[PDB]
Amino acid sequence: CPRFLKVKNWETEVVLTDTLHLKSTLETGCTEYICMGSIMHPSQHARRPEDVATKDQLFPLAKEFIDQYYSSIKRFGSKAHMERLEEVNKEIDTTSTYQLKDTELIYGAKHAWRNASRCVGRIQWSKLQVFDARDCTTAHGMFNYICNHVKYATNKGNLRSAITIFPQRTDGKHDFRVWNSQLIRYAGYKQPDGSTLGDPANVQFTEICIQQGWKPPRGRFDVLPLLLQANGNDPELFQIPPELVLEVPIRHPKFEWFKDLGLKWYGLPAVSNMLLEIGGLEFSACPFSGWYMGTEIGVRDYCDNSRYNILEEVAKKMNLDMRKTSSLWKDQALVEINIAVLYSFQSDKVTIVDHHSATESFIKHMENEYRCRGGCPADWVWIVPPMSGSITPVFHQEMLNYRLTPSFEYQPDPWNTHVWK
Amino acid sequence: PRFLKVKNWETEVVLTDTLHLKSTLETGCTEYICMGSIMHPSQHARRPEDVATKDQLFPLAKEFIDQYYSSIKRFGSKAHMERLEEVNKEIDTTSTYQLKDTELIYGAKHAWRNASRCVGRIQWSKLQVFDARDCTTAHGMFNYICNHVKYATNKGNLRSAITIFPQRTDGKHDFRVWNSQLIRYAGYKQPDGSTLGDPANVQFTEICIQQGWKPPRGRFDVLPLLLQANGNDPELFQIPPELVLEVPIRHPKFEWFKDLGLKWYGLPAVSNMLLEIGGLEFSACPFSGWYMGTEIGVRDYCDNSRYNILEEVAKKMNLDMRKTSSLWKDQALVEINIAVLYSFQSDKVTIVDHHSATESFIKHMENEYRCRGGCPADWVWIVPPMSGSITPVFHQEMLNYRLTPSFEYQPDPWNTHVW
Numbered sequence: 001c002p003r004f005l006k007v008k009n010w011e012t013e014v015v016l017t018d019t020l021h022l023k024s025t026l027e028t029g030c031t032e033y034i035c036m037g038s039i040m041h042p043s044q045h046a047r048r049p050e051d052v053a054t055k056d057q058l059f060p061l062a063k064e065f066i067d068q069y070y071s072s073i074k075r076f077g078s079k080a081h082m083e084r085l086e087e088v089n090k091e092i093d094t095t096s097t098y099q100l101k102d103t104e105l106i107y108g109a110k111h112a113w114r115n116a117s118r119c120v121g122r123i124q125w126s127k128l129q130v131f132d133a134r135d136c137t138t139a140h141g142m143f144n145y146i147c148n149h150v151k152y153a154t155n156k157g158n159l160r161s162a163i164t165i166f167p168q169r170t171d172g173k174h175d176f177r178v179w180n181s182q183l184i185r186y187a188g189y190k191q192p193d194g195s196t197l198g199d200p201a202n203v204q205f206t207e208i209c210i211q212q213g214w215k216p217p218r219g220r221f222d223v224l225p226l227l228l229q230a231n232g233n234d235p236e237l238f239q240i241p242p243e244l245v246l247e248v249p250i251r252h253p254k255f256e257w258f259k260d261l262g263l264k265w266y267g268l269p270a271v272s273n274m275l276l277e278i279g280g281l282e283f284s285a286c287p288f289s290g291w292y293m294g295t296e297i298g299v300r301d302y303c304d305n306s307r308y309n310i311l312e313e314v315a316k317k318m319n320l321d322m323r324k325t326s327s328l329w330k331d332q333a334l335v336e337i338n339i340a341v342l343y344s345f346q347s348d349k350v351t352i353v354d355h356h357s358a359t360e361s362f363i364k365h366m367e368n369e370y371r372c373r374g375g376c377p378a379d380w381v382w383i384v385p386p387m388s389g390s391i392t393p394v395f396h397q398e399m400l401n402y403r404l405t406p407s408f409e410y411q412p413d414p415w416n417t418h419v420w421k
Numbered sequence: 422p423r424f425l426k427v428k429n430w431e432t433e434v435v436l437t438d439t440l441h442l443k444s445t446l447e448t449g450c451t452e453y454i455c456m457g458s459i460m461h462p463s464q465h466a467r468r469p470e471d472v473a474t475k476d477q478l479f480p481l482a483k484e485f486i487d488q489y490y491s492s493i494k495r496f497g498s499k500a501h502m503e504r505l506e507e508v509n510k511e512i513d514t515t516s517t518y519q520l521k522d523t524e525l526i527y528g529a530k531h532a533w534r535n536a537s538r539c540v541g542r543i544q545w546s547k548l549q550v551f552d553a554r555d556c557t558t559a560h561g562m563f564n565y566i567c568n569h570v571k572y573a574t575n576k577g578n579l580r581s582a583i584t585i586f587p588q589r590t591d592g593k594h595d596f597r598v599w600n601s602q603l604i605r606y607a608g609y610k611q612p613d614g615s616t617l618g619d620p621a622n623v624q625f626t627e628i629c630i631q632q633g634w635k636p637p638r639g640r641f642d643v644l645p646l647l648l649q650a651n652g653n654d655p656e657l658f659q660i661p662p663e664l665v666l667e668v669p670i671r672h673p674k675f676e677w678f679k680d681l682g683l684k685w686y687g688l689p690a691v692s693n694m695l696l697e698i699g700g701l702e703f704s705a706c707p708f709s710g711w712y713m714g715t716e717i718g719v720r721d722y723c724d725n726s727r728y729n730i731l732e733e734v735a736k737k738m739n740l741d742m743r744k745t746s747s748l749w750k751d752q753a754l755v756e757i758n759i760a761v762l763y764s765f766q767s768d769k770v771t772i773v774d775h776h777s778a779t780e781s782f783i784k785h786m787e788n789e790y791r792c793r794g795g796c797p798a799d800w801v802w803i804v805p806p807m808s809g810s811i812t813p814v815f816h817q818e819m820l821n822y823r824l825t826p827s828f829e830y831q832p833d834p835w836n837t838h839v840w
């Protein structure tokens with residue numbers, strides 16, 4: 001409970017003072033005697049589907065958000081503010097829920113991004129195209145909204161960050177869900193001999209898709225179909241029009257052989273399995289997209305052992321000594337791979353940001369947030385890039401982590417909870 | 422209050438922590454705010470003003486004695502009872518107490534064991550403990566330190582060691598090694614605003630000069646020892662040069678690399694921390710191991726506020742340094758770390774690469790969970806400063822918590838000492 005918490009940057013000596021943490025809403029997982037800062041999903045970053053808020057629970061949550069909204073537009077205590085409070089309250093009282101105004105929906109989505117501790121790209125938070133899909137009733141409808149989102153966001157390579165928001169949760173038996181973890185991801189296939197074709201991360205969902213009727217090409221980079229659930233009904237399959245899926249073949253500025261590896265990736269990162277919470281309301285289907293930081297593809301997607309795992313093959317074509325770890329052959333290959341990814345995206349004029357630029361922008365964003373907001377919650381474990389950590393400025397930047405609402409939350413995979421019709 | 426699980430997202434192995442239930446010190450976090458990236462929260466530090474009392478001391482003493490006799494399977498033995506008795510009579514009549522030699526060794530090993538930020542802990546029980554609690558003067562300190570340095574260097578076959586000087590009494594009679602490490606390079610603020618040598622040590626260097634040290638004013642001048650005994654003014658000593666093992670850094674492919682004139686010392690020996698055991702505080706306890714290559718190759722050489730050599734190397738590598746997206750820094754960084762490892766190895770000086778070390782640490786965790794019910798570990802420090810996610814610790818969930826005996830931070834003595 002101290003009113004002021006300070007963070008230091010150990011490279012610049014800049015010290016920042018945080019007061020925003022006083023507005024913190026939920027638990028982190030940590031206590032006085034233990035820190036869970038490297039735990040990926042503590043119980044508080046998640047949202048179980050059947051605990052739907054009671055009337056009594058929802059009132060103060062809505063009011064909290066409404067007050068925050070009118071505060072932001074400098075109309076706090078105003079007649080419109082008081083009238084909105086009364087309306088929401090009356091609405092909660094007679095329907096056990098309430099509907100957000102368009103302005104509020106837009107404000108809440110933007111602030112869930114602004115509040116996202118683990119996102120290094122938040123300097124962009126105020127530029128977010130919000131698509132209101134709350135009139136959607138069927139999975140065909142969801143498919144139509146998602147196609148339009150993908151096309152708008154892709155913009156022929158000049159990517160624009162966007163979110164599409166489907167109807168909020170009601171009784172929890174009528175959820176809208178995108179079963180895909182991202183709108184665009186490649187299939188993975190377990191072979192009888194134990195090997196994996198395509199993306200090992202997506203094996204389970206790929207199998208579900210095939211069970212649901214999807215005919216798989218069974219290649220290395222097969223774009224998965226959308227698996228879409230409207231109003232708690234069984235999910236349904238749709239092929240994304242291929243012309244809407246922008247891809248980049250990976251080549252290297254110096255190594256002519258690099259193109260022979262046959263690698264490519266998609267331009268549009270679009271996470272679709274998270275939950276958006278605004279004023280106690282739960283939007284279980286809210287796909288959002290931006291553009292890539294190169295390391296997300298070049299370090300994690302490609303060089304993770306449980307992913308495409310290409311380090312060995314790259315090192316071999318580089319004719320490195322792969323006998324001792326102390327030769328840093330993995331490190332050497334890792335850099336070249338990330339060079340190729342950045343180079344291939346820029347060459348095709350597809351928006352991408354390197355981890356040096358992104359982290360420097362983030363430090364500037366953080367400083368501005370401390371100034372204009374009283375703080376900026378940040379998760380160092382996620383903010384620091386997966387390669388070259390200490391030669392980026394976020395490595396030396398102390399951060400405070402805490403949960404502000406509106407927020408994006410994890411939710412359980414829908415196939416674990418769905419009551420099949 | 423529960424059994425907590427940690428998952429490794431690469432191997433899917435799940436460990437169960439019960440050891441955290443034993444912890445007594447605070448971490449810095451609360452239920453609503455995580456401070457896992459704060460370098461020195463109020464709880465990892467030890468101010469000399471905060472000296473114990475009879476009232477505070479015995480419970481801490483009993484706690485440690487109890488854990489010691491449990492570790493040697495003699496909890497509640499006649500020896501255990503008598504020891505508790507002995508320690509209380511002693512705190513009564515002296516306001517403190519002295520550790521048995523067995524206790525001191527046990528205490529130092531476990532301080533290392535419990536160091537949540539140290540990736541080298543698989544080695545924790547291989548520690549040479551030098552008891553210097555009979556020391557009374559800075560000359561005595563220097564002698565002990567020379568012996569430490571000589572033993573631990575061992576002609577390049579490095580051996581872990583710690584030397585323990587007398588414990589804090591009233592706080593006016595502290596023993597302190599003013600150096601941050603036993604062996605470090607000097608830094609000099611140049612007239613033209615820049616820094617010659619190591620910028621990390623500019624302040625300490627100035628104090629050495631102010632105290633009479635005659636600086637060679639080079640890029641790698643070994644600093645003098647500056648030694649404080651029993652609260653007296655610190656005294657300067659030159660470590661005999663034949664005791665200081667150094668490695669010239671060269672590259673296995675780049676013949677021009679040796680021409681950069683880089684070198685480093687072989688023995689990492691941190692001397693500015695505080696060892697706490699059974700409520701007693703050891704303000705001077707230099708301890709040494711061997712290097713993980715990134716400590717030198719990534720942080721020492723490439724931190725902006727350190728030797729800052731990336732530009733030079735990339736220049737010699739003829740890389741395109743106009744766009745960050747060419748990853749020219751990342752390239753130069755890998756090469757420097759290749760050189761460092763290759764140089765130490767060629768000179769048969771003990772060193773470990775970050776792949777090997779993170780690998781050993783994961784095995785260590787598994788060992789500790791099995792035999793101890795957990796291992797406190799600080800992901801922020803454990804993950805190496807380069808190539809993080811291609812080392813196994815990146816994907817290892819870790820719980821951080823504070824066990825005692827511990828190593829703690831303490832304020833630099835020049836911020837307190839009255840001359």
Ligand code: HEM
Pocket residue numbers: 113116118119120121122124128161162163288289290291292293296353358382408
């Ligand atoms: C505009 C360019 C953007 C960039 C460069 C960017 C960058 C990143 C990166 C690199 C990560 C870590 C990814 C990983 O390790 O898997 C991340 C996480 C995240 N991003 Fe951003 N992002 C961008 C846009 C957005 C947008 C538009 C939103 C939402 C409206 C968003 C919300 C999030 C969230 C909620 C997380 C972490 C989720 C969690 O695990 O808690 N980002 N971002």
Ligand code: HEM
Pocket residue numbers: 529533536538539540541542544548581582583708709710711712713716773778802828
């Ligand atoms: C034997 C080989 C050892 C290796 C390879 C090793 C490795 C490391 C590394 C890489 C760090 C991080 C340093 C930094 O980032 O600046 C570290 C920190 C640390 N080491 Fe070890 N170490 C070793 C031995 C020891 C010994 C012998 C002790 C004490 C008896 C020790 C106690 C500590 C402590 C207390 C810290 C962090 C202090 C803090 O900030 O809380 N280590 N070690």
Ligand SMILES: Cc1cc(N)nc2cc(-c3cccc(CN)c3)ccc12
Pocket residue numbers: 269270271288289290291292293296
């Ligand atoms: C919008 C956006 C842009 C971008 N460049 N990266 C993103 C990464 C995530 C993300 C969050 C949690 C887990 C994972 C694992 N795949 C990814 C979410 C949104 C992102």
Ligand SMILES: Cc1cc(N)nc2cc(-c3cccc(CN)c3)ccc12
Pocket residue numbers: 689690691708709710711712713716
């Ligand atoms: C024994 C040993 C071996 C080794 N290889 N590294 C070490 C690093 C530290 C350390 C602790 C806190 C801050 C810093 C800042 N440079 C360094 C302590 C002991 C070490």
Ligand SMILES: C[C@H](O)[C@H](O)[C@H]1CNc2nc(N)[nH]c(=O)c2N1
Pocket residue numbers: 010395396397398399458459460801802803804
């Ligand atoms: C701000 C941050 O806590 C600080 O830069 C830390 C991060 N992780 C580190 N990790 C190690 N091993 N050593 C360090 O000095 C640091 N510094």
Ligand SMILES: C[C@H](O)[C@H](O)[C@H]1CNc2nc(N)[nH]c(=O)c2N1
Pocket residue numbers: 037038039040381382383384430815816817818819
């Ligand atoms: C165990 C650890 O928390 C886990 O591997 C985290 C570490 N940091 C990360 N950081 C980012 N940006 N993305 C990740 O997926 C992870 N994974």
Ligand SMILES: [Zn+2]
Pocket residue numbers: 030031034035036037450454455456457
């Ligand atoms: Zn924490």
